[PDB]
Design a protein around this motif. Sequence first.
Motif, PDB file in Angstrom:
ATOM      1  N   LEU A  66       0.822  -1.203   0.000  1.00 11.21           N
ATOM      2  CA  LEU A  66       0.000   0.000   0.000  1.00 11.21           C
ATOM      3  C   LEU A  66       0.858   1.256   0.000  1.00 11.21           C
ATOM      4  N   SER A  67       1.945   1.250   0.768  1.00  9.61           N
ATOM      5  CA  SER A  67       2.851   2.395   0.761  1.00  9.61           C
ATOM      6  C   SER A  67       3.455   2.607  -0.621  1.00  9.61           C
ATOM      7  CB  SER A  67       3.952   2.194   1.800  1.00  9.61           C
ATOM      8  N   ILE A  68       3.872   1.524  -1.274  1.00  7.60           N
ATOM      9  CA  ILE A  68       4.444   1.618  -2.612  1.00  7.60           C
ATOM     10  C   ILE A  68       3.420   2.183  -3.583  1.00  7.60           C
ATOM     11  N   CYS A  69       2.184   1.690  -3.509  1.00 13.33           N
ATOM     12  CA  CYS A  69       1.145   2.197  -4.397  1.00 13.33           C
ATOM     13  C   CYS A  69       0.860   3.669  -4.130  1.00 13.33           C
ATOM     14  CB  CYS A  69      -0.128   1.371  -4.231  1.00 13.33           C
ATOM     15  N   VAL A  70       0.887   4.078  -2.863  1.00  7.83           N
ATOM     16  CA  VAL A  70       0.716   5.489  -2.527  1.00  7.83           C
ATOM     17  C   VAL A  70       1.830   6.318  -3.150  1.00  7.83           C
ATOM     18  N   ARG A  71       3.065   5.837  -3.035  1.00 10.73           N
ATOM     19  CA  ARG A  71       4.192   6.578  -3.582  1.00 10.73           C
ATOM     20  C   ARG A  71       4.107   6.661  -5.099  1.00 10.73           C
ATOM     21  N   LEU A  72       3.719   5.567  -5.754  1.00 10.80           N
ATOM     22  CA  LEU A  72       3.531   5.597  -7.202  1.00 10.80           C
ATOM     23  C   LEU A  72       2.432   6.575  -7.600  1.00 10.80           C
ATOM     24  N   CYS A  73       1.312   6.559  -6.875  1.00 11.55           N
ATOM     25  CA  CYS A  73       0.204   7.443  -7.212  1.00 11.55           C
ATOM     26  C   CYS A  73       0.596   8.904  -7.062  1.00 11.55           C
ATOM     27  CB  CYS A  73      -1.003   7.125  -6.332  1.00 11.55           C
ATOM     28  N   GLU A  74       1.312   9.248  -5.991  1.00 14.93           N
ATOM     29  CA  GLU A  74       1.775  10.625  -5.890  1.00 14.93           C
ATOM     30  C   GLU A  74       2.896  10.919  -6.877  1.00 14.93           C
ATOM     31  N   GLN A  75       3.624   9.893  -7.324  1.00 18.62           N
ATOM     32  CA  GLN A  75       4.591  10.053  -8.400  1.00 18.62           C
ATOM     33  C   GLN A  75       3.928  10.318  -9.743  1.00 18.62           C
TER      34      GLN A  75
END
Lengths: 129, 67, 64
Positions: free
Chosen positions: C26-35
């Motif tokens: 979930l953290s990775i997906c959050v970082r990708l989404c804000e990326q």
Amino acid sequence: VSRILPVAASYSTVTRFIEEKSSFEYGQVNHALAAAMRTLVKEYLVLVTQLEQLQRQGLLSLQKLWFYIQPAMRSLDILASLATSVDKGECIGGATLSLLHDRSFSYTGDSQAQELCLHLTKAASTPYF
Amino acid sequence: SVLDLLVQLAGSGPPRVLQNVRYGGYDCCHLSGIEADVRSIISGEEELCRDLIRKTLQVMEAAPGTG
Amino acid sequence: NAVRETMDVLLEISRILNTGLDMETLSICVRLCEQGINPEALSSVIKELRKATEALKAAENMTS
């Protein structure tokens, strides 16, 4: 029979070794070694269970037992030799770990024994580590 | 977009098979039926687990044991 | 704190949603989404890697 019996002798030695070295006084390293030996003895019992099933089907004999038991004969000889050496030098802690390393080297000749001892050494070093 | 990704991923986990007062007309078989079905599900699941462990042991006893 | 609360709310939501995204996933997906990475592409990659991981874990299990 007497060629096979050394396996059962080794087994009685391994069992006594496990019992002794599963008392708290004998140390956690020896405790974990006894636990691994208990796993191996369970495997042995499973093997003998399968051989009993083949007996009960009237489908095993002498040489087949002698054939089937040869890998197990070597394995149990190795296990009992390790147990007896560790017991007779009353090795504890890093002493025992040293002995296990050296034995693992001396059992380099056969791959079955090598795999067994590497499993055991990893497992027993887990508490020590 | 995280919620969208979760939406696409939804349903991808393992499926689940198991997870003042009455007015005199509220007497309903549905509540009692539900309780009966639950107490059935418990029992049944336990006997299924017993059967599966028995089958696993039966196979192992038919297996060589060294691999 | 708000990020952490959103994080564990999403964890519970996905768990109910039968999708099973973990903490760091979930953290990775959050970082990708804000990326700036499309959620649909993220989910497609996630499902493809889920299938690949299932197949590879099966193969490695029989390769043990």
